[PDB]
Design a protein around this nucleic acid. Sequence first.
RNA 1: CCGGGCACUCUAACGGGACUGCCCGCGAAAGCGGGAGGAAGGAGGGGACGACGUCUGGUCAGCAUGGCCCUUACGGCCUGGGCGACACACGUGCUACAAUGCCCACUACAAAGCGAUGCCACCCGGCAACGGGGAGCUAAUCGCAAAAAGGUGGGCCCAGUUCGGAUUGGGGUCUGCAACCCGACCCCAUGAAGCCGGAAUCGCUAGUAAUCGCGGAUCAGCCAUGCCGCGGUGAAUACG
Lengths: 80, 24, 60, 206, 155, 127, 118, 98
Amino acid sequence: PRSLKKGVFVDDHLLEKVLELNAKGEKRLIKTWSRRSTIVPEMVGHTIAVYNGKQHVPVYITENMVGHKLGEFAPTRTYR
Amino acid sequence: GKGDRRTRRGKIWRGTYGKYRPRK
Amino acid sequence: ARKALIEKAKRTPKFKVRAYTRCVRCGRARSVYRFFGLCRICLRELAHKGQLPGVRKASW
Amino acid sequence: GNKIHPIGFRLGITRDWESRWYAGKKQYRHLLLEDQRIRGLLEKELYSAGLARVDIERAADNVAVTVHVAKPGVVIGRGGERIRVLREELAKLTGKNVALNVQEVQNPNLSAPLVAQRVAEQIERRFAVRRAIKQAVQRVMESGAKGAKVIVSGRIGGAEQARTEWAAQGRVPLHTLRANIDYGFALARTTYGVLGVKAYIFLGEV
Amino acid sequence: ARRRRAEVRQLQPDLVYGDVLVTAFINKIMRDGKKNLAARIFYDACKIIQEKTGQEPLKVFKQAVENVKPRMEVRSRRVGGANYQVPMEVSPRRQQSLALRWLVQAANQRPERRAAVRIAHELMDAAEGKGGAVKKKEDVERMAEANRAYAHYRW
Amino acid sequence: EQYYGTGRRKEAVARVFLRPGNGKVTVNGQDFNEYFQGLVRAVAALEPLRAVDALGHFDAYITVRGGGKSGQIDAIKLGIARALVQYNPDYRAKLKPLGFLTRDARVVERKKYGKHKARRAPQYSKR
Amino acid sequence: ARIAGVEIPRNKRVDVALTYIYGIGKARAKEALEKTGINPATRVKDLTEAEVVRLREYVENTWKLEGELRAEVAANIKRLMDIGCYRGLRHRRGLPVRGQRTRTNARTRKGPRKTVAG
Amino acid sequence: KIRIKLRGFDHKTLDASAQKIVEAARRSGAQVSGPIPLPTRVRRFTVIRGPFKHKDSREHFELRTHNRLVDIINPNRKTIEQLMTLDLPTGVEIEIKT
RNA sequence: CCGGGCACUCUAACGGGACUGCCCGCGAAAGCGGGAGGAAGGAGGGGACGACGUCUGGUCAGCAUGGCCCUUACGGCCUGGGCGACACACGUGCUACAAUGCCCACUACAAAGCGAUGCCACCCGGCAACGGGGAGCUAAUCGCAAAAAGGUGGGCCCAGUUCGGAUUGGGGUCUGCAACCCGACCCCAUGAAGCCGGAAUCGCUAGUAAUCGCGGAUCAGCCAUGCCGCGGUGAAUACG
Ligand SMILES: [K+]
Ligand SMILES: [Mg+2]
Ligand SMILES: [Mg+2]
Ligand SMILES: [Mg+2]
Ligand SMILES: [Mg+2]
Ligand SMILES: [Mg+2]
Ligand SMILES: [Mg+2]
Ligand SMILES: [Mg+2]
Ligand SMILES: [Mg+2]
Ligand SMILES: [Mg+2]
Ligand SMILES: [Mg+2]
Ligand SMILES: [Mg+2]
Ligand SMILES: [Mg+2]
Ligand SMILES: [Mg+2]
Ligand SMILES: [Mg+2]
Ligand SMILES: [Mg+2]
Ligand SMILES: [Mg+2]
Ligand SMILES: [Mg+2]
Ligand SMILES: [Mg+2]
Ligand SMILES: [Mg+2]
Ligand SMILES: [Mg+2]
Ligand SMILES: [Mg+2]
Ligand SMILES: [Mg+2]
Ligand SMILES: [Mg+2]
Ligand SMILES: [Mg+2]
Ligand SMILES: [Mg+2]
Ligand SMILES: [Mg+2]
Ligand SMILES: [Mg+2]
Ligand SMILES: [Zn+2]
């Protein structure tokens, strides 16, 4: 039951980076501190290291992961 | 009671308007 | 009221949301009345000293 | 945790506001900040003259700042250049370009702020605090002043334990609204700590 | 009340029968400060008293209240380290208060669907000498006078 | 020709105009039973008349506003009492034992800090 | 009668009786009875066989219902878990998913109260 | 037909200034309609007494704004002779319209 | 609503008014009991107000301040996370467990406040949150606005339900650079525990308790069921 608005927001930090990678190939791990950005289809297949507040976790993106944020796959807190 | 979203008293308690409390 | 945080007053807060209000006298952050621009403590002090025109003790 | 400020307790009757002017909700805070800066720069320069009160009035870009000083010869300066420099700093801080007035205080021992300032100077000079308070109350009572009281806070005489010296005489009816009690507060910055000096002067009934 | 004697409130007379006891019963029925709803309940109950009993509902009400009034009750008292159930008489005001409170409470214990039917049936049964309120009176007059040995602890 | 009474109860006013007539009451243009009749104490507002047992000598035009309708009923009572007193002062000795000319000064008490509604102290446990 | 599944309401108002359908609350019951032109006041035992066929025709395929609904909710939660999402973790541990506090109640998500020493 | 709205914090200064305006406009104008109370605008402020927790004292203050509605009729040209600059009050604000 | 007028209501300045003054009884007096008259009496009701001092009470984290300590970091900037972590325990609250009730429709009364990068009548689109347009309002004159319980009519008929809306799935709105951690709101679906609560324990003596809604401060938005105020209906009981 979530929503943001028309004109979905994606941080333009990695937005240019992922397309620059697609322009020449499938280059390796990217490091991103912007977990507020939304997943777009042109990211499927890459691997993004999301900063969980302490380290960078290597989140691999698949087809069924489009629409969510990067922070949803990078848990910040540690428990048990 | 006052905790139901889809009731009149619920919209009055939460102080909102909707399908279950129009503005005439 | 740390001196560094008194950098709050800024023509370039880089965002409208990041701009918050502080007490102009003591530098407080919370309980900062917008009408006077002061905090609550400085409000009471300057009201007792009589430096706030028209401000009076309420009793009814 | 008691004994509210008497000036703030009597702001309705037998006491008036230091700042008396009207301002909208969009202008009140700015004029208040301006008055606060005025009093700040004023008390940082005229302390040698013993200023007891600074009244501020506003009609329209004109401020009738009136300073009550026991010794106006210091705020006037030689031939009147001191007041010129002070009005210059006034026009520089606030571009309102306003005037200024000085009122002499007869018998400075009847204005409680000046009494508290005198006791604070004595305490700062390493004077006997008990004798300071006693002599101050005596000087106040010996010229009118149907009531008097002077209180000095902790660290009396540089002691390790905070005390409170009372030394009051006369009539100080704080709970009486019409009492018309002048109140004055002063600090004493010493090598060992801070001394708080409160002065209550009771005069007139109705 | 320690200093004074706590004089009793005088209630406005009833808008129909002109009885202050009826108004006190209205107040005992009243809930969350709803006077109109309580008066509706009681007056509809009075309409139920007739066409079920040929007698006027005021007489039935007063006779039921008289039948619920207890003559003696039992208060606890700490004596010698123990706590005893001492029997003693009841002042008339407490008789009226307990009578009306028991009437209301026993009426709300009935299985009847709506309130007016409950109040009407309870009033009728209490008038003819039965119901939960008369059971409460009998239980109080059993507890008291069941501990007659402690009557010298009257105070 | 016309006798006026103000009356007041719990922040509510009700202009009472007594003009001799049939005995029908009007309140804010509506009928006495179209504003009331759904409030049981409504008839109490007419107790002054029953106090002098006129009940048919005066028609009433009442303009009520303020508070709630029950305070309005009591203010109407006081206003009828005042107009009836202005009619004949000899009625005062008849209305004084019933306290109808007595202004009911019970007003909603002001809410105070520290409490919930002006007296209801917040529950504590101490453990 | 038998409408939109193996569930049969009986002997009450048609809208309230349709509330007992899994994919149907009160709003959808009112909508169905409004587009089908059926009086909601009548009891179920007073329904015409033609009216039952009409309500069945509409409700059977207008929205997703019991079996497909439960399976689709299970598939949504299973997808949230299989993608490694944070909501998938909250469902995995049985904790509040919509950003509530867990230092206190939210017992209804954690089940009974398993008291330990302290 | 000239609208006048007086606003102030002191009920004495507004009243004295309004009576001064009325007396200055009576001799040089028409039958002045006098001032109208124009109900007060009260704005309260609740502030905890102590600098720390101590939540249950709150010592609230108020600030009131009173108004006056002189509204002289027949704006004669002789009336403004005694008017438009003759005033004692300071903490009083004046609003004038046509 | 127009003409029209300050009688009433209201509005806000001043003033009158209650002092055991008067009557009876008691009493040395102060005063007590009752009564008259009065709008009101025996402190009329409510605030503001809280002594010498006590708790080495609380706060150097609002501010000030003595001493001590850090000064290529115990100072400073930024991104992100955290203060929202959950096997558990307590305090304060909110919503309930229903028929003196719930729901739907129609309809009737309040006070105190707030309002210009604001309140937003009204029209259109939209089931709605809301959006587009746009009138008025420097505001006793325009707006927030609907007060709610209540009344009238109808539905529900004692069942975990037309009680109760927790949880969860899905689709959206708005604020904001940005709602994953971690917003409120709307719509559909879901429908939990809960049948008046153990030992124990709390508040309140009259317009009080109880119950019902309304506003405000801080605030772009809001986790407010908090806090401070406002009015509506309006009890029970005090032998001691
Ligand atoms: K101490
Ligand atoms: Mg969108
Ligand atoms: Mg419900
Ligand atoms: Mg500092
Ligand atoms: Mg902010
Ligand atoms: Mg019983
Ligand atoms: Mg209330
Ligand atoms: Mg269902
Ligand atoms: Mg959480
Ligand atoms: Mg206090
Ligand atoms: Mg007049
Ligand atoms: Mg008059
Ligand atoms: Mg006193
Ligand atoms: Mg300590
Ligand atoms: Mg400590
Ligand atoms: Mg916290
Ligand atoms: Mg744990
Ligand atoms: Mg463990
Ligand atoms: Mg604890
Ligand atoms: Mg429409
Ligand atoms: Mg008007
Ligand atoms: Mg009905
Ligand atoms: Mg249900
Ligand atoms: Mg169960
Ligand atoms: Mg049940
Ligand atoms: Mg008491
Ligand atoms: Mg807000
Ligand atoms: Mg609120
Ligand atoms: Zn401050």
